[PDB]
Assembly symmetry: D2
Homo-oligomer: 323 residues x 4
């Protein structure tokens, strides 16, 4: 088999940042990525614009420079590839880590391709692989998506969006521009404070001109092949519907996390993996986490801007264990 000093599961922005900082402290590292690098960003909608400025998304001391104020999807894809190029990062792409076991101060990593042995382990798997479950009658129909890519095919179609945060509002804007009849169904009372303040004005003007239907205090009770039923303050309504976008968020792969021996503790910000807030080391010795995997479900506490700093913290703790 292969023996490397450190292995990092996940080649996202926070995973890449973890390998760069470990390499800067003289630790030979290998990233194993289920797809290719920044697969999460690659899976954004094709039109997506980041909400951060491009400099705040930069890692490794490679400047992220874009004429525009905020960068789009593909611009980040080009950047992070150059980040891997510049730091000469070892990246085993299209390989899925399936099992991690610790044996006498060593890890045994079993993937889809090879078997690995390492001293240090860093899990930066994010949460985008596991979408929250809808739990309404009809939620498993093929007309229900939890991911948004493009809006053109839904031209002149009756579309319902479940959710109220940035994914829902973003998709509604793109779906309206493509000729779809968009009905957003949010359970809250007012707009979520997490919708960024420069996007909501363009959405509110559309609901004022009666181009997009917005409904508050709305919970979806039934989804059929061609209808959607939702209740507002008790009153049930049923409308024709062709597709449903369940933008209800994501959550980490807790099944994988417990199978290595990591505990879920639940605390201030919620159900999160147990880790030392000063070193990001988990309850399992020599196993660290990095990225949005440390926040839990809450998709507003940790993002790319602050998750990229975990690598520098992990690098210090690993170099310390070298007595």
């Amino acid at each position: 088999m292969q023996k490397v000093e450190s292995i990092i599961i996940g080649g996202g922005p926070c995973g890449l940042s973890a390998a760069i900082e470990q390499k800067r402290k003289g630790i030979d590292t290998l990233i194993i990525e289920k797809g290719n690098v920044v697969e999460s960003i690659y899976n954004y909608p094709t039109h997506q614009t980041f909400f951060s400025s491009s400099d705040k998304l930069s890692i490794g001391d490679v400047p992220f420079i874009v004429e525009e104020s905020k960068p789009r999807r593909n611009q980040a894809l080009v950047y992070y590839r150059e980040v891997v190029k510049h730091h000469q990062l070892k990246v085993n792409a299209f390989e899925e880590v399936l099992t991690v076991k610790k044996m006498n101060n060593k890890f045994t990593i079993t993937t889809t391709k090879d078997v690995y042995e390492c001293r240090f382990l860093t899990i930066a798997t994010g949460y985008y692989g596991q979408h929250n479950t809808l739990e309404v009658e009809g939620a498993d129909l093929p007309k229900v998506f939890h991911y948004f890519k493009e809006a053109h095919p839904y031209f002149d179609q009756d579309v319902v969006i479940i959710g109220g945060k940035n994914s829902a509002i973003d998709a509604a804007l793109e779906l309206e521009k493509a000729g779809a009849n968009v009905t957003v169904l949010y359970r809250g009372g007012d707009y979520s404070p997490s919708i960024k303040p420069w996007i909501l004005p363009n959405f509110t003007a559309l609901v004022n001109h009666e181009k997009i239907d917005m409904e508050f205090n709305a919970n979806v009770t039934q989804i059929t092949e061609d209808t959607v039923t939702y209740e507002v303050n008790g009153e049930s309504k049923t409308i024709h519907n062709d597709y449903v976008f369940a933008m209800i968020g994501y959550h980490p792969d807790y099944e994988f996390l417990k199978s290595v021996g990591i505990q879920i503790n639940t605390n201030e910000f919620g159900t999160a993996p147990m880790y030392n807030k000063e070193t990001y080391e988990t309850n399992i010795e020599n196993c660290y986490i990095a990225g949005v995997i440390a926040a839990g479900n809450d998709a507003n506490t940790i993002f790319i801007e602050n998750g990229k700093f975990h690598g520098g913290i992990i690098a210090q703790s690993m170099l310390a264990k070298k007595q």
Copy 2:
């Protein structure tokens, strides 16, 4: 059942142009589309730029205006949606025509959703849905694609492209820019004259700088999961390979075309469906074809520029039969 005067199978540019012109002659028409309108363009590579100027792609008195010299994908998607909006065209989306049978002087169309009765039938299904068969050992592996979408996931991967016309060179440029190691194997002797003269210089420069491996007179003999074997002037060569893009063209759904009763004619123009060159009517009475489906093999005779004129021709012939 539903009874409409005319039905058009396919909502591509030539299908839309056919429906516009029939409506101009007072013919009630219905488009049945397997996906949504201009699904072909929607399935282009994401970065794709058209070879034609935007005026040449315009149909049914709706001007196609783009600040750019040549229009990109999405821009055509936005345009053709506005064409459907402007001309009030009936488009039953996500419905696939499965069976056509002639009874008396009327057609019985059976789809995935409904059954229809019409007098005139127009088949404009194109050829993009059916890729040419490779016919080499290993062609059925999941690592072999006949369609190109994006190049980022193949970053730092060993990629081989089979083909030599515009699809191959476009994919090679995008794959080279995304950091892949590209090797183009062409069975021809020199560059195909059908490569647009403003794209090829960008390709040959990278070949001269040895950034893209180009092989002429090369035929692929075997594809494994991680090698590709090809012969050059008799010499067999084997290189490591991660993915294969078989850009070997497409062909019409001849099975569906024979299942309605339309003849395939072995002509010295590239084997094409049987139709009257002056009206585009097939051997079946009141059944027409439109678009690139009339060129059969050669994907270089008919494109959007001249295929959009089929609609005007069919409308005259149908108006001659009156009603």
Copy 3:
């Protein structure tokens, strides 16, 4: 000379709009344009993005379509040309109108290139060409601009913006992106309500991060070649400064409008030419106005979305006079 039935002064969106609807009613027209068509849009900042949708700017039987939600400066340029191409409009470019005198029931039009005599006249000259005067010492210095174009050359320069409307806010964001040290000096108390609610948060965040200096209740008192002096509730402050953008708004060429015999107003909500509202005809018979030149009395503003609809109202009034 030349004699045309109707002549229109100005080739902006509303000048083009009035020509189309008069032609639809069978009125032969000629557009006399100081520059070329939509000179105003051409003289936007190079980066500029409209705040309207792409179809609220569309005129006369030509759809305006863009893959983006809001079109940019260059896309409108390409569009409004194609509108002229589609409608076969007669436009005389680089020809400024200098004198209009009403003799008989006709007009004699004196331009920089020929003499014209016409029955119907439309003055659609807008306001973007005549900038409000600054009224501070040093306003005539070469370091003082009333137009923003690009931000690059002011990289690592000390810049000051006078005003607080969308013009001042847009130019500040662009100059910050280009690395300039920007100080916005506004005479008002809070943020102008006319700032687009999707633009303000970007300017707000930069100010709080101390990337852009924002001083409310600020009045500029002096401009030297290397400083700018401004008072904030009486307290004077003087800072090093390399360039100045007086984004203090604009006003129509009223001097020209009176010189033909059209009265002004200055009533409560502003100041406007006299027009019938129902025909847009002025006190001068057979003399019409169109565009943002008509704003001033109404409590609402005039953009391209509304002002473009004036050409239709004018066409009926001219068709009524036959």
Copy 4:
């Protein structure tokens, strides 16, 4: 009055690169730029796309990364600003060097604002500031430009282009798309070999479809207020004309170069300042040149790709002369 070790006249790509490389060897440098940094690039047409790839334009180890194949004008502006930011370069902008004289072991530099004294001088002023002389009757009229910016104001105007290289061909394409009536007058016999091979097809197709007038072997003899008279192999023609674009090239400020005491040596392939090819030092001790100002004799073309390496070579020569 002000004393710095080294001064660089010109803040273009090659000037900026020279200051970075000198700073890498511990030399205190000051750039004096008539406008701001890369003013030459700033004065391109607003649409201009580079013919080099973005990697080849990179300097002072700051990567120039752009999603697209080739970088456009503004994108280079954004990049080079970040280069000055990243290296912290002293850039006295809007200052024009008027006089340079050698005294003792010092130079006395007189600008528009201050006076400077330095040991090492590097002149990297380029050529884009001083246009070649037209030498036909009417060349000083306001309707005659030697610089192209945008094409919209010339919509539906009669425009004549003098020249035959990329500047002329680029301007012809941009002016045609804006509705101008373009006549190109080239004193050559065939298309210039310096036109890029991926642009000539686009220009070729417009000439063959009679949308642009192309006239070889044409020399302009007179420019009037609204006509232009030109002879082709002696035969004179006169056409109506509203504006004239004299794309007849540019040349360095040789007068400024001779006024400091550097010899300009005429030869074949053009005329260049005299300098040692291994240090780029002129006949004046401690006076160097950098950038495209160095081309002329050596029979080689200079662009940003190769001009950016002068700084590293000059830095060695300045370091060899010690302190």
